[PDB]
Design a protein around this ligand. Sequence first.
Ligand code: NAP
Length: 316
Amino acid sequence: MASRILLNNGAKMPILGLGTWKSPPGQVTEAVKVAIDVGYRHIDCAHVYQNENEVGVAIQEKLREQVVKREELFIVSKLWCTYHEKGLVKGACQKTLSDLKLDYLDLYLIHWPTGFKPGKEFFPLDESGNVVPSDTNILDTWAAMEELVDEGLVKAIGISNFNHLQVEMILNKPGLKYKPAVNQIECHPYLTQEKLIQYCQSKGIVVTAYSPLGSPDRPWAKPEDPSLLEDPRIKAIAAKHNKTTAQVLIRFPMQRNLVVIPKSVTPERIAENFKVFDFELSSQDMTTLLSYNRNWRVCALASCTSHKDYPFHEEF
Ligand SMILES: NC(=O)c1ccc[n+]([C@@H]2O[C@H](COP(=O)([O-])OP(=O)(O)OC[C@H]3O[C@@H](n4cnc5c(N)ncnc54)[C@H](OP(=O)(O)O)[C@@H]3O)[C@@H](O)[C@H]2O)c1
């Protein structure tokens, strides 16, 4: 298992990164410092997570301490839905760069294909509770992302939560200048994503798997919900390999040629989650894990199902 995957912009991306959604601002600086200390070189960020300033404090301190060089880090962030307008993309990127203490991002993603009305609220609502859309389409937002490459603000651009028809729309864009490098999507044994992964990989787009542990801290979790970390069948595979269930859940996407971004703010777990380069799941293990698919989504963007660009009506 090599530690990095080659992107279609010619750069290499570490296959293991640290997630930061829901990482409290008072804990994420230490989480990122610990992660870098124990070997992580890829941090997954977003403006909507409201903690990029604190992530940036950690990155800057580890650069200042010379624990790592900037060229050895792979920092990812995402353009929020209220910034899909052509005239807002650069400023949104610049705010993220300022907060992260960086002069470029390694990868900048369109967070969702759905654009929302600009303004202070991340989910602008009408009086009846529907999200208010923007009329800016996927393709004009993509052109604005391409400009960020040409201005030196980002080394690579990509997409997140795009279904295969939406990926295809980008790939078929008239005058396309840079292909998406990555599509970041939810993926784990209960949402195995075979069809969308095969499509993206066949086009040279690298897939990053989010919520690989099933996001047990997601705010809308219900007690009755499925639990990957507590699935006895997955625990059994872990026991056979003398690893933890989380380690199996992280190694699984790695062996599908995916990048994976488990989140933790717990120092012991941050270190545990990185110790996944010392064992191999068999093909039988992999097929068995794939068999657990239930089409179960942590992140359905449930308030936006009527948006014209809502991604999850299509089969994939
Ligand atoms: N592009 C998108 O739309 C999108 C959407 C969702 C997620 N993401 C990205 O993907 C990242 C990962 O997804 P996620 O945050 O939803 O969830 P996740 O990584 O599947 O699960 C995180 C949860 O698992 C716990 N955990 C971590 N390591 C563990 C271990 N070894 N043993 C037991 N529990 C463990 C964490 O607890 P502690 O933190 O308390 O240790 C936390 O509650 C996000 O943080 C974000 O960066 C992107």
